[PDB]
Design a protein around this ligand. Sequence first.
Ligand code: LYG
Length: 275
Amino acid sequence: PLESQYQVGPLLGSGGFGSVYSGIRVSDNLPVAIKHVEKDRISDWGELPNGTRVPMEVVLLKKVSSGFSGVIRLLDWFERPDSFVLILERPEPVQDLFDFITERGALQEELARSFFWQVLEAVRHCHNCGVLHRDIKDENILIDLNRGELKLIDFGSGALLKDTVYTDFDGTRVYSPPEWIRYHRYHGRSAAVWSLGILLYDMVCGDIPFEHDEEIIRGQVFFRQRVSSECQHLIRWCLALRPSDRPTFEEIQNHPWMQDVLLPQETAEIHLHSL
Ligand SMILES: O=c1[nH]c(CN2CC[C@H](O)C2)nc2c1sc1ccc(Cl)cc12
């Protein structure tokens, strides 16, 4: 047990009410993120395979951890009287997709296609593991600036994936679909695909398409930057008003705009400058 197996560093992130510290695993120097979660604001508890009462976030992290590098891995966790503490992998150097977009504006299609594809692979891997993220967005995506690999983070609004209707939601409103806004219901996959359309527009236009409830419900997309027709068609497809008109993961990945994606390595050399 105990907190001498990590050395705590500076607080990460530039705002918000959460607490995440840069850390280093004393045992082997592995860089890690130390995320503190308060009991008071966990609304969702689950119970572990061996049946302990933990935050849903932990149950979901444990279900998606494993060889595949597309989701940040939970390396360990500890409970305290008033909070849980989660130890996760930390790439170094790293930058979130929100900052990266703040710095570099709208991304070339080629870089968006490669980022977007790795996001699809990560989300497929969560779904495949029985986990629904429910807050896919540029702040919840890390870029490993050296290998050009993206990593999905923050399962704090997620749920077990199921085929029936969800009537609760706690993620980011401007990424949530029109069926949630109007009826307080949605289904997992189709909701996630809407958030993927918002994300792809964000990447190619440098900002999200909708801020207000009405624009979400209206679902009309205006492009403010030059964006190929195939990419605009994928986006409008993801943002179909009717859930059953959205594409599956498989159709998104077999879309003509998704062909000939760069490997992560090439993506970092070309767009992140590696060598
Ligand atoms: O689960 C997380 N949450 C957050 C916090 N935030 C709340 C604001 C944003 O949604 C995400 N950061 C991280 C994680 S894992 C992780 C791993 C490496 C690094 Cl460098 C940061 C993080």
